[model samples]
Target: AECSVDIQGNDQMQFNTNAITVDKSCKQFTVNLSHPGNLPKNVMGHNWVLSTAADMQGVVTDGMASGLDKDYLKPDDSRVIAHTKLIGSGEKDSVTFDVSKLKEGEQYMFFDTFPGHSALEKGTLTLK
Candidate 1:
């Protein structure tokens, strides 16, 4: 738990956890996102995306512009500090990010990026 965490999203479009704290002692942090429901990716899927809270709305809006053929999120998005693959039922994905990128007391957020499969883009991420 010092270097990595596990989180999941349900078919109901909700994440099991809504917050994460990364230890400043870590050089890297990994986030694992999983789905174990019955729906297909086209219908229900989630990916872990981290960004500054101020960029959340535009990030969501930008990611929403893409189709399911590609991930809803923009490729090589500088605004995204880290992100995982979009996954559906029985699928799991993980992403590792630089712990150094996080600044103390800065507002950060985590959320799933998908169209209708999306929620309010849950979770707060902080470095301790």
Candidate 2:
């Protein structure tokens, strides 16, 4: 039952950190996302989405079809472990997921599903 972890997305379509570690003691983990740029969402929107590294491509493909209003994610997509809503400059959002969703030695992928954003915004999450 820890608090949360912080992540940042800037105008350059990148996240500040490329990896996150979730302690096994935590029953749940929270991912806090922030955008520090001045651009608006439609132009430089960002979101935090989690799935297996193997599913990243498929998820991103389907997410592109979901559009921005859906946070650039497929509607009710079971492959998505958790996600935060899209936000623009100076805006923030958070998503919490049960620690049970993660497994030891398994590397979960996290990224921004904003069309081409994933190429730069993606990262890895590991359970400790």
Q: Pick by TM-score: which candidate is best?
A: 2
| Candidate 2 lDDT, 1-128, residue by residue in tens | 45489999888777878999888998989999999979988888999999988888889999999887887888888888889988999998999889898888887899998979999999999888
Model 1 weakest 10-residue run by lDDT: 113-122
Candidate 1 lDDT over residue span 1-128, tens digit each: 47999898787678777889898889999988889789877788788889999998777788888667667886667898889888889999989988889998998989888875446548999998
Question: What stretches of model 1 exceed 4 Å from their correct place?
Answer: 116-121
- Candidate 2 worst ten-residue window by lDDT: 1-10
Number of clashes in every candidate structure?
0, 0
